[PDB]
Structure 1
């Protein structure tokens, strides 16, 4: 009846074909609602490859909805596809890996959004762990990527209820631009039980290097 138009893409270093799951989903897809599917796969992710391909499939056929699949966890990717979403207005979502990985605050125009979760909420999950074994956390630092300012507020919001007896010791930012040392000397000042990290794995790599020198790696941190 409706005969909707939909597209899905599987990108991967782990073996499966979209065809496999294509026919599967259409079978499973079949009874509930009408759907027309075009499946395509691409091997490695690029801003140019993804943008070009998605525009290439979408324009040729008037698809209304798609999803995204990947065997990679790259951080930037989500934002890129999100950018496409702001202009297109075509619903997008993703089921695995990086697309599923969280992203910065969604724009006023609706974008693709399956990976994102309230970082605040995520922190409250972590807090539950902190509630069980963590009090007076060593540090919360807005080091890199989205929400440096945003993460900062929630800690305050969590602390603001004042239902229990919460408190903070370390509260700074920064990394790469100058000597790591201005942040490091400040970090030396804090003396607490649990380090809180809000930085990318790349930054973190360096941070790991920082912590060993710092002594954060040692017990009680």
Structure 2
């Protein structure tokens, strides 16, 4: 019946090829049983690729081709696109390496990459930034070919968003093996931004992270975000990658090669089945190199369209006209303390599912200690100085000039170790003072309210309130309506008073 071919190039064990056709007696779940064919190049060079595709085409009449590569191979995507354009055969790229989206396809192309574009990744990264309320970021791009598309995408996403996205500085570096050591440290030394979005290849990403570590740009107080270009073989990341690096991948990142091959075979089978049930006949197999078609046949243009909109096992695999995946279930992953890539959030349908209410920061990359510029600011509520409010319903988040403050835990029912918090928006005189202080001294802060006590009172030998939080190392500083007196100065150190107060008596003049 239907002939679907699987092409290789990941090398590794050689027995897997047999399994690739053993699964022939596994597709009984899929209607319209498919005859597979397994031939795998082991040098992944243009000559072998072209010759093996030529022989595979010449030997048996194939209806679709599935390609897979390991990692970090650039020009294979162009070769597969060229072969698809010439021979007019529907190819399907799975796994990685060749799954990086190649945006401008040839008019007759049928590459149909199983990847996600740059614009969607930037959309999800900006959604994450909105979730964690990081309005001011800086963009660091190399001279890798494609940075122009990245800049256009970030500008488009910034413009096409309700939030007032701030672009602090865009600086183009010059990475590469060895290269020009200088002119990067100087530029990275004067980028004043708490969150950085970087775009560079795997080796360039490693070099950039090493330079930033030498430049004091990693650790708490600095959050890095990268697309899949920086990630290579997520099974094992390099040591130069800083803990807390955030990226966005597709759902299939955790799947195995066999599962991806099954998914691609299922996609081709469902496309062929839809074509058969629409036209009442099996799809016409492709030809070979000789006698190039020229104008795309109407049957080809119909089989391609049928293959476009296909849904399998819940997840939808609709393909954009450009050849990539439109509206996929994307997962936002990050590098944990133990240097292992683990999922942090999902995307599903336009809605973020983050498992950290507050973004964590770790003692990693704190060799000079002073790099711990991050602070946690305990605070209370007093009507003139600090006032909280519910998030603005129109655009979520908060109103401009309103710092997001998380109430201490969820004491109403979670009065325990449970970390999840509850978000509110804080403003007032003391919040303005704290904002100006963070702008001048150049530090970052996590503002949070206090639930145990109000301002501090020695009860049974312990301290509660903001004084209690600061005295017990739970907060690096406390700001609000905190009065300076002798008992508090003996256990904690105050600052110069910024508003003079005292004890006063109020009466009724009526």
Structure having the higher strand fraction is 2
3-state DSSP class of the match of 1:179? Answer: coil
Task: From the superposition, tell whether residues 202 and 134 of structure 1 become closer, same or farther in structure 2 (CA, over 3 Å).
Answer: farther
Q: Which residue of 2 aligns with 1:38?
A: 37
Alpha-carbon shift at residue 180 of structure 1 (Å): 5.3
Q: Distance in 1 between matches of 2:133 and 2:42?
A: 43
Q: Which residue of 2 aligns with 1:88?
A: 87
Pairing 1:2-81 to 2, within 5 Å after superposition:
3-11=1-9, 12-14=11-13, 17-25=16-24, 27-28=26-27, 32-33=31-32, 35-70=34-69, 72-76=70-74, 77-81=76-80
Alpha-carbon shift at residue 122 of structure 1 (Å): 0.8
Q: Which residue of 2 aligns with 1:117?
A: 116
Q: Distance in 2 between matches of 1:93 and 1:193?
A: 40
Deviates more, 1:159-168 or 1:8-17: 8-17
Larger radius of gyration: 2
TM-score by length of 1: 0.81
Task: From the superposition, tell whether residues 140 and 84 of structure 1 become closer, same or farther in structure 2 (CA, over 3 Å).
Answer: farther
Q: Distance in 2 between matches of 1:31 and 1:219?
A: 50
Q: Which residue of 2 aligns with 1:131?
A: 130
Structure 1: where are the runs of 5+ without partners? none
Q: Distance in 2 between matches of 1:63 and 1:78?
A: 20
TM-score by length of 2: 0.38
Deviates more, 1:35-44 or 1:165-174: 35-44
Can you list the C-alpha shifts for 1:69-89, whole angstroms capped at 9, x where unaligned? 34x212313333223223332
3-state DSSP class of the match of 1:171? Answer: strand
Task: From the superposition, tell whether residues 22 and 202 of structure 1 become closer, same or farther in structure 2 (CA, over 3 Å).
Answer: same
> Retained in 1: the 8 A contact 2:64–2:90?
yes
Q: Distance in 1 between matches of 2:2 and 2:44?
A: 28
Q: Which residue of 2 aligns with 1:141?
A: 140
3-state DSSP class of the match of 2:162? Answer: coil
Q: Which protein, 1 or 2, shows the higher relative CO under an 8 Å CA cutoff with sep ≥ 6? A: 1
Q: Which residue of 1 aligns with 2:106?
A: 108
Q: Quick check: 1:205 aligned with 2:206?
A: yes
Task: From the superposition, tell whether residues 194 and 48 of structure 1 become closer, same or farther in structure 2 (CA, over 3 Å).
Answer: farther
Deviates more, 1:194-203 or 1:156-165: 156-165
Alpha-carbon shift at residue 61 of structure 1 (Å): 3.1
Task: From the superposition, tell whether residues 218 and 38 of structure 1 become closer, same or farther in structure 2 (CA, over 3 Å).
Answer: closer
3-state DSSP class of the match of 1:74? Answer: coil
Task: From the superposition, tell whether residues 87 and 183 of structure 1 become closer, same or farther in structure 2 (CA, over 3 Å).
Answer: farther
> Retained in 2: the 8 A contact 1:69–1:96?
yes
Structure 2: where are the runs of 5+ without partners? 223-510
Alpha-carbon shift at residue 152 of structure 1 (Å): 0.7
3-state DSSP class of the match of 1:215? Answer: coil
Alpha-carbon shift at residue 48 of structure 1 (Å): 3.0
Q: Which residue of 2 aligns with 1:219?
A: 220
> Retained in 2: the 8 A contact 1:83–1:111?
no
> Retained in 2: the 8 A contact 1:86–1:107?
no
- CA RMSD, 1 decimal: 2.8
> Retained in 2: the 8 A contact 1:144–1:203?
no
Q: Which residue of 2 aligns with 1:185?
A: 186
3-state DSSP class of the match of 2:68? Answer: strand
Can you list the C-alpha shifts for 1:94-146, whole angstroms capped at 9, x where unaligned? 2323233x233131322413233121111121222212225145422331445
Task: From the superposition, tell whether residues 27 and 111 of structure 1 become closer, same or farther in structure 2 (CA, over 3 Å).
Answer: same
Alpha-carbon shift at residue 148 of structure 1 (Å): 0.8
Q: Which residue of 2 aligns with 1:97?
A: 96
Deviates more, 1:115-124 or 1:3-12: 3-12
